Amino acid sequence: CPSVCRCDRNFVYCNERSLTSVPLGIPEGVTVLYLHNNQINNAGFPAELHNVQSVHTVYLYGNQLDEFPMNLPKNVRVLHLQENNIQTISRAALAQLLKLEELHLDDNSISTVGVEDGAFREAISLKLLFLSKNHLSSVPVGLPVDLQELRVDENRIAVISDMAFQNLTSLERLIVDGNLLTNKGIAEGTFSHLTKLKEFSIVRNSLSHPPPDLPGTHLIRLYLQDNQINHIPLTAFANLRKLERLDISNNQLRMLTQGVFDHLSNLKQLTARNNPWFCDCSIKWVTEWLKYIPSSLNVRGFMCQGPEQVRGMAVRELNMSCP
Template sequence: ACVRNCRCDSRNNVYCIENSWTFVPYGIPVETRSLNMYRNNITNGPTTNANLERLINLKKLDMHQNDLKSFPIGLPNSLELIYFQKNDIKYIGRNSLHGLSNLNELHLDENNITNKGLSSVAFKDATRLMELVLTNNLLTAVPEGLPVSLRVLRLDNNLVQRVTVSALQPLTRLIRLDLSGNSIIQNFVEPSAFLGLHRLRTLDVSANRLTQIPKGLPDNLDELLLSKNSIEFVYSTSSDDGSPTAHGSLSGLTMLTKLDLSSNKLQSVEYGAFDGQQRLRTCELQNNPWQCDCYLTYLKRWLSSTTTTLSSERNTRCSTPQAFSGVTL
């Protein structure tokens, strides 16, 4: 029999949604494979922990939009998908994910997770985790101790300022990394922080506080998204001298098919800055204060000879000198 005020179907899916539950009830069938208890008022407690722990066949647990303050302990080892977004989770301890070796996706977006509230060994048992979503939390740095199995890591719309080698270096299987909408500062990105990500295809660091293209980007990148930063110039080669003016470039990134440099502070590019971009299909250069003088001749020639599509071409215009203001590049 199904729990009162819940719905069970023949595929062992249970739905106890939008019923003001404050705990996970007793009596959910042990054969349940998908438990959906979203949009309730469930809080942490021994009743919730005990009634979840007994569901030894559970594959999917959806408890988004509840009132959890910490990651529930004792979850069944069978779980593959967990949705805890839109709660009030502040704490994920060292044993919170104990035994969850089958977990494939974990969604923790729109909580109140900080670096201090996230144990550096919290993910030690999550050896098969491939997608981790921490969007819209309160993280100030890329967390340490994330599982090496990750393919997708979303840290967008946090408070991240710092990107370290020690946090990213183990994530050699990562394919997509989203750091957009943070406060990443150029000098707080450690040299070669991204370099070990040999399988990375998409890097999104748009809407941050970068003043240069980051140094040491992996050469296998397919998409590099840098819009809404404060980049003023694109160099033809990288500078690795460790000085405050050290910078990155597009040199070596010959696999790129999409490049977004829109809405920065770009005025010019160095001669040869886009050489080697034979695979580039889409390039976003609009909404920049381009200075259309003789130093921009290289870029104009490259744009006229490349097969790359220049998106929003009408908005890619000269800003200075005054005689050319508003003229399409």
């Protein structure tokens, strides 16, 4: 055990000690390693730290790191690297942590150029990757096959390549919300091969319509909130039969095309709040759909914003003005 750093019940507590580098005196049989809330630099990692095989959980949040740390313990499953100033992600550093299952790179200055081509792909055991609040311009191409959750929210992402989600059949959750993403930015059939995907979130983005060619093999939740969606195509919600929760709130939708929720048989909840719904003969089907829909479906937000004669009233409570 180190001189300044304390250890209790096979847990190393180096946290809140203002350490410039990771200490040398790390015992052979330690469970969890705490090195958070310090001033540890990128060149403060000894080669002997990688030799320790007993450690599976390492905390390194709120440090002075600039790159992804090297010589980290070989058999680490969960790794926390949030609240620091990481900019560069190296292919060699992630090749060391072969048993890495969970990774947190939140609140950092990570960019597309900083991430080396196929750096994350090296981490073969990677199931959970949290790239929240970074300066990333696009989704990296070299991603792990065994990935189950990709949270790349609150970034500067505008484009998504067709090769970015290559071989990722095991991915269940994809959170790409709070980005500069557009429908032209996303490649044709980029999400199509995500068979095991259960949840999809793209809130606070600039999409003119929902992403085309989405798989409904295991998709349950679809979030299209706070977007610039003006229209929804007839084939968009089609082939998504297993969907339960849907959200189209806070968009620029004027009306909905007849037979859009026709294929959604397992639907349970729908939200369309804060949308400029123009109540005319275009929403006649919406009124009839809401009248015959079972109580199992929770539909909210269908209110008239125009014209003034219909304004304020709910679409479900309407009667028509036209044939």
